[PDB]
Structure 1
Amino acid sequence: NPIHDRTSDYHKYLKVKQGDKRYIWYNPDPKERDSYECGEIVSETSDSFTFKTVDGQDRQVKKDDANQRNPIKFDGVEDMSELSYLNEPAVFHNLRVRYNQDLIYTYSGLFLVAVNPFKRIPIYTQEMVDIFKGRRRNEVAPHIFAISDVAYRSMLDDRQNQSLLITGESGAGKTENTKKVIQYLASVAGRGVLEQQILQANPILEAFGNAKTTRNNNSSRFGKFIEIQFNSAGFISGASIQSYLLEKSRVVFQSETERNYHIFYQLLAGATAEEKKALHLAGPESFNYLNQSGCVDIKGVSDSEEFKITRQAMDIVGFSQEEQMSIFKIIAGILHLGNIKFEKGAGEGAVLKDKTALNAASTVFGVNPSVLEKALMEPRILAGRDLVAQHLNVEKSSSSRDALVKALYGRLFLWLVKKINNVLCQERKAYFIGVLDIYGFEIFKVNSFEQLCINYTNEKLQQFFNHHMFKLEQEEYLKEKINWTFIDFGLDSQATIDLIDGRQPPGILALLDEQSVFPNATDNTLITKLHSHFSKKNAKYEEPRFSKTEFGVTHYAGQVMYEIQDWLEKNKDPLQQDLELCFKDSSDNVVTKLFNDPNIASRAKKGANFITVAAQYKEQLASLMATLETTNPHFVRCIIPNNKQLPAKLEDKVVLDQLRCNGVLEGIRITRKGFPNRIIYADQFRFGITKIFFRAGQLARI
């Protein structure tokens, strides 16, 4: 048995190795508050300590300001709830002592904390999977597999659906830990053909949905909620996937050093000679949508080998050979569309001198090139009562072409997800475990509409955590008749949530919708309206001193400033009707579905027109939260060690910044209020029915 055998790989890679006066943490330099050393207390007054620094000098500190150091026997503890002192340096210290020993997982009350190693650690083999089967949390070391098993056993024992919510910043480890949860469940609860199809769905969605960014070589540019479905006996019976917030803008623009979606590079590197001539392909350097960032490859990645893996995955899930060729025709067609060069004609209207790129796109898509040309440059628009062809200039022709491209890619992604769900999903499941892998709360140099949607999502998810914690504590105090009072910290989030999504008074999204669905609005009328409603009037909003295009929201994790440019266009997401008509006539069996199937081609109906993008997202998030409220949740907080993608480099400011805003420091302290330590009679106070409660510090003195 590996857990009692001290020679096992389990002991080597997952445990602190087992063999056969007063101190504080202080800053040598007060201008670097996250850099600490150890000092020894040598005397005291009623309100201060005097201690010796590392170089042997005397310094004084107030007793209320002092960060006391825990007894050294606690350095490396598996759950930080055991520590006497929970100040900032003490919590960071325990996480660092563990990281120094390649121990990346640590508990902190309800949280599993996971620090990215940026190297391979051999703790995810089938042999490691087998160790965690049926073990309680306090019976085995911290691990993503441990919380997965606890969720599975709770499903079987309590007959209740479960969820695992995995969060953190870009590059922190959300997607890798999600993959390990699915791996674990497929093993412990699997047979099989179905199980392989669930696992093989992942490379398909990562090829079309992930890309290299400055923060992560395999960054997710969408969110996902994966439901693993089980029969009443506890075996896997199906799965379903929901997708959120795909970054369609990446198809047409990438910042310096980043890439487009992986699939474009996979097709160009991996296609055969026959496929290349049939699709009119060349290298990535010959396509505008791939030749502007200065990066066409990723270190350690072979795009041709990845193309094989993508095609094998498509075969296993069950896409036909004709379906696969049509998918690649759409990817090729998008590249050709990006090479169309609009130029100024005799007047202000655009012309197309060379027809090569237009004809190549038209051939692969199966559309009429003369019809497509007129739809791009001379679309018929309703002006008053007249339907009239309007000759667009170079800027507007190019923007319309970009709109076509983004619509083709977004609709293709939806179709891929729907086809996967057709294979995997069941009408009759008994129970489920859901895993959420979505963008974390983050602040960038520019935050726009998509980032507001992300940070709004995380505001609701943090409220959900705080309300859960409140209910657990309330249950235990009222089950012991201990008549002590405390507040639900979930209530503290409601002001920010209402500022964003409220109806009356109207919030930010409601005002955006009002400006979008009637005429005469601009980005200036929009920002002006937001300030009119909220500046010096809502305590969670700020109008800037100088900027005319930005506004501030006070979130749980701090203030974020957002910009307004293009929000009206983003909320409507327009595409010319003559372009819709052109592609509705396609001879291709997949393209025809992207334009003729209303479940893919259109958002939902609202009034005499359609719902906006913001209203669609509010509804999508509300549906997700309703599902989560029916489950028993589990929480994983992923932490990135530095901003250089390097191992063995745990940077004090990078990590402490995350701990101050990811809820770890605030949460572990909240459970010290009142009476944290409880123990049955057999094993400063208020008497209960079966246990002895005790305020902070009392049990440690005993």
Structure 2
Amino acid sequence: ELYTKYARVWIPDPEEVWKSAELLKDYKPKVLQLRLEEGKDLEYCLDPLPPLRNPDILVGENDLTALSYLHEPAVLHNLKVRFIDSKLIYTYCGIVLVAINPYEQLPIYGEDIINAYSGQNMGDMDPHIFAVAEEAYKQMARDERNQSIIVSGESGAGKTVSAKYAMRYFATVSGSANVEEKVLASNPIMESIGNAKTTRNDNSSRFGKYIEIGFDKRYRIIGANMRTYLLEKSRVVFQAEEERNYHIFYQLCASAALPEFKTLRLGNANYFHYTKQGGSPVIDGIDDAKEMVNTRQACTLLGISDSYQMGIFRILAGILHLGNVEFASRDSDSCAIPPKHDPLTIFCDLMGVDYEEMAHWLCHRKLATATETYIKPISKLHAINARDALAKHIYANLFNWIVDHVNKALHSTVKQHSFIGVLDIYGFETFEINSFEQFCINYANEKLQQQFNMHVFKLEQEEYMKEQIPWTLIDFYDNQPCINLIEAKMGVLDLLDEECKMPKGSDDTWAQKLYNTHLNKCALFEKPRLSNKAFIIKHFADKVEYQCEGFLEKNKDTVYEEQIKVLKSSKKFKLLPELFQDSKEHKKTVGHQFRNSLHLLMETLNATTPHYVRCIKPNDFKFPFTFDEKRAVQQLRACGVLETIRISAAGFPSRWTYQEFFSRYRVLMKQKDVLSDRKQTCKNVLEKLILDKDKYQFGKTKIFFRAGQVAYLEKIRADKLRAACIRIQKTIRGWLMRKKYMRMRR
């Protein structure tokens, strides 16, 4: 309880998530009279308290956990003032670095600052991405244990540029005669194959890129190794409204007029069924004909020969032409490709395969028992599904092959002693419409934040063992029940892979199975009130409503072996047989391939020690260096920052070294009372100032405080300092009064 005249509080507002407010009448233990901006009128109805505000000296601190009052208003305010007023974009919460897109360039990344950060401990400096890279480089020396820097956030938050600078740090401080050129020259390739225009923004990354920087026995940089995970295969063949698929297809179509690409017989970017679907072939302000050239130049720099470059573009033109193969039904249970079909003719020319063999195998499938073998016609729906699954399989193998030749260039022969690994992964996502892609992204982010919450929980048990404080005080948010909802058997994914193979399964019967299995059995699964074709999962960040329409089309892969054996028979050019050179994997659905890829990522990260960077995007409009409250709060919830802050607020947020406590509160402690050691001095003085220890704890090295007690100490400190100023000023002012008085008497 503190609320008085001249107190300040935060109040909610639909325009800006909180308004500052002056408390205009003292609180009495039932409705509050408040002054505001824009004059004053409110009375504010408490319900069976307003958030209460940190004294202005605290706000703007380097570390959001160093605040005395912790809540969403305080956090949003600190980040807003640091970004707008001080032009500082980096901030700490707990262990987490928080980074805000200044979204215009800055001096700050200079080599002078790189050198200034080297050797510094993370609390010695103002926050910067180099402070995280430096802490990683330290921890890799202090223990041989490898280190991971996990960069996460919405698309456009600056995850790629943050990784760029994090690598520039290692390459400056460790590096010597090169990795930097090759890694940065790889980006236009991986962006071309792996980024797409999403609804909310262009140039979204649809995969988790992981760069391992390798070090030798003396922590010189050896080289790098690039891995990729969680590739969004389904975008190759299906696109929502005003999406595109991966840029490479559009750079290719825009380059169709070039003489190398005449043979590929490409058309405009909406001639093909796999690029037409989105209805938006041109990005505003991107010239795809030139991004093509920057891609081919990046390939050339990484030493993919022009022969292989033309192989790559030949296969991509293959996929585009394949998409235009149209199947005619001849029966309810059989279909055929019409005679002399032009898209297939061009496809078989490009790939160098017999037209009538592909024409046969696209429309038929084959079974063999141990003795004897059968050839089945298939329905037009299964033919279209098989062709789409073949296109997805080609694209995924091409992607793994380009990544493998990049690794050929990035690897170096010296034996890697240890690595620091940097992970650029899309953040928790929520859109006015959410579909199977979003469901996968949010499941991956559930796993990553399980890891995060366990790491933080471990770290604070170990700090309490450094400080002999009971463990029972601390608890953590457990999101295993939602992972089990999505992932366990009879989970949302398991019933989807089942409905993919049950006869005449559909999104409507899938949804019915979900309701039957979970609707009132699980607390985290909910049905939307007015629909039968959607369901709600209560993720850590928010409730998200997913739409069942078109999960099953996106879910399905089965690649008919006979089509791979036709492609593997190709003799025209080197690359296409080489892709498929090394089963059950052909049956696996997109959801199951995603689950497995995510388990590989988590096996990679749990073997490591993480350091976290969260990136947030200030504004949707690309305005330089301005900030929107309503988005930023959504970002800071999606990053789990607000939960981390709340959890810390439940415990003992504020931790003061005894000597810093003295440096602050010498005014509180009497020139008589101070002892021959300040640790015992402050141990006494605080017991003087606050009667009950439960507000605080005494560690070996720090005083621990519950939230708010520091603001109290600053209040009483400032009132006592003003009473001292009253004494001294009153004496000097009274002297001048005396002086002029006696002059008048004189």
TM-score by length of 1: 0.85
SS in 2 for 1:671: helix
The answer to whether the Cα contact below 8 Å between 1:677 and 1:696 also exists between their aligned partners in 2 is no
- Aligned pairs for 1:155-554 within 5 A: 155-270=140-255, 273-284=258-269, 286-291=271-276, 293-342=278-327, 349-352=335-338, 355-376=341-362, 378-382=363-367, 387-390=374-377, 392-393=379-380, 397-425=383-411, 428-483=415-470, 485-490=472-477, 492-503=478-489, 506-514=490-498, 522-554=506-538
What's 1:576 paired with? 560
Q: Which runs of 5+ in 1 are unaligned?
A: 1-20
| Partner Cα separation in structure 2 for residue 603 and residue 533 of structure 1 | 28
Choose from 635, 644, 652 the match for 1:658. Answer: 635
The one of 72, 77, 85 aligned to 2:61: 77
Amino acid of the structure 1 residue aligned with 2:349: T
The 2-side partners of 1:250 and 1:539 are apart by 32
Q: Does 2:89 correspond to 1:104?
A: yes
Q: Whole-Å Cα distance in 1 between the matches of residues 395 and 699 of structure 2?
A: 61
Whole-Å separation in 1 of the counterparts to 2:600 and 2:313: 33
How many Å separate the matches in 2 of 1:486 and 1:626? 31
| 1:270-296 Cα deviation digits (max 9, x unpaired) | 578431333233443544444454433
**Percent of matched pairs sharing the same residue:** 44
Report the CA distance shift for 1:99/1:565 in structure 2 as closer, same or farther (over 3 A). same
Letter in 2 for 1:679: T
Q: 1:345·1:351 contact (CA, 8 Å) conserved in 2?
A: no
Is the aligned partner of 1:695 residue 2:706?
yes
> Which one-letter code corresponds to 1:420 in the other structure?
V
Measure the CA separation in 2 of the matches of 1:514 and 1:456: 19
* CA pair 630-426 structure 1, distance change in 2 beyond 3 A: farther
Work out whether residues 50 and 61 of structure 1, in 8 Å CA contact, stay in contact via their aligned partners in 2: no
**CA-CA distance at 1:515 after TM superposition:** 5.0
Q: Which amino acid aligns with 1:315?
A: T
For the structure 1 residues 415 and 69, does the alpha-carbon distance in structure 2 shift closer, same or farther, using more than 3 Å as the test?
same
Check the 8 A contact 1:270/1:308 in 2, yes or no: no
Q: 1:5 — aligned with what? A: none
SS at match of 2:615: strand
Q: 1:487 to 1:160 in 2, by over 3 A?
A: same
Displacement of 1:585: 0.9
What is the Cα-based RMSD across aligned positions, in Å? 3.3
| Distance 1:229-1:291 versus aligned 2 partners, 3 A rule | same
1:34 correspondence with 2:17: yes
Task: Tell me, yes or no, if the aligned pair for 1:105 and 1:114 is still in contact at 8 Å.
Answer: yes
2:35 aligned with 1:52, yes or no?
A: yes
1:343 Cα deviation from its structure 2 partner: 5.5
Q: CA deviation at 1:239?
A: 2.4
Once residues 128 and 309 of structure 1 are traced to their aligned partners in structure 2, the CA distance between those partners, rounded to angstroms, is: 31
Code of the residue aligned with 1:364 in structure 2: it is L
The aligned counterpart of 1:88 is 72
CA contact (8 A) 2:71 2:645 kept: no
Give the match's secondary structure for 2:235.
helix
Q: State how far apart, in whole Å, the 2-side matches of 1:641 and 1:61 are.
A: 32
Bigger mean CA deviation after superposition, 349-358 or 361-370 = 349-358
Give the deviation of 1:209 after TM superposition: 0.7
Shift of 1:369: 1.9
Conserved in 2, the CA contact under 8 Å of 1:441 and 1:458?
yes
Question: Which residue of structure 1 aligns with residue 657 of structure 2?
Answer: 679
User: Per-residue displacement from partner, 1:533-568 (whole Å, max 9, x unpaired)?
Assistant: 322222222244453333332221122233445555
**Partner residue, 2:607:** 630
Query: What is the aligned residue count?
Result: 668
Letter in 1 for 2:146: N
Alignment of 1:120-135 (within 5 A): 120-135=105-120
Distance 1:209 1:192, change over 3 A: farther
Q: Report how far residue 409 of structure 1 moved.
A: 1.2
> C-alpha separation between the residues in 2 aligned to 1:696 and 1:372?
71
Q: Does the 8 A contact of 1:267 with 1:307 survive in 2?
A: yes
1:8-59 per-residue CA deviation (whole Å, 9 max, x = no partner) reads: xxxxxxxxxxxxx7342444x8665714143244534347764323314463
Whether the 8 Å CA contact 1:677–1:699 is kept in 2: the answer is no
CA offsets 1:558-581 (integer angstroms, 9 cap, x no match): 222334455556555113333223
Q: CA deviation at 1:206?
A: 1.0
Q: How far did residue 592 of structure 1 move? A: 0.7
Deviations 1:190-242 (A, max 9, x none): 22444433332222111111122232221112222222221121122232233
For the structure 1 residues 497 and 415, does the alpha-carbon distance in structure 2 shift closer, same or farther, using more than 3 Å as the test?
Answer: same
Describe the SS at the equivalent of 1:313: helix
Cα 1:532–1:282 change in 2 (3 A) is closer
Read off the aligned partner of 2:706 and give its amino acid letter: R
Deviations 1:56-110 (A, max 9, x none): 4463575991333333333432222232222322221111112213322222222
- 1:391 to partner: Cα distance: 6.5
- What letter corresponds to residue 185 of structure 2 in structure 1? Q
More off after superposition, 126-135 vs 70-79? 126-135
Return the offset for 1:517. 6.2
CA gap of 1:325–1:666, structure 2 versus 1, over 3 A, is: same
Larger radius of gyration: 2
Work out whether 1:153 is the aligned partner of 2:164. no
Secondary structure at the aligned position of 1:51 is classed as strand
| Equivalent residue, structure 2, for 1:137 | 122
**Aligned-pair CA distance for 1:673:** 3.5
Give, in whole Å, the separation in 1 of the partners of 2:272 and 2:198: 20
Deviates more, 1:248-257 or 1:111-120: 248-257
CA drift at 1:248: 2.8
CA offset digits 1:583-631 (Å, max 9, x no partner): 1211122111233x24xxx664xxxx85554444333323322332333
**Measured at CA, do residues 380 and 88 of structure 1 come closer, stay the same or move farther in structure 2, by a change above 3 Å?**
closer
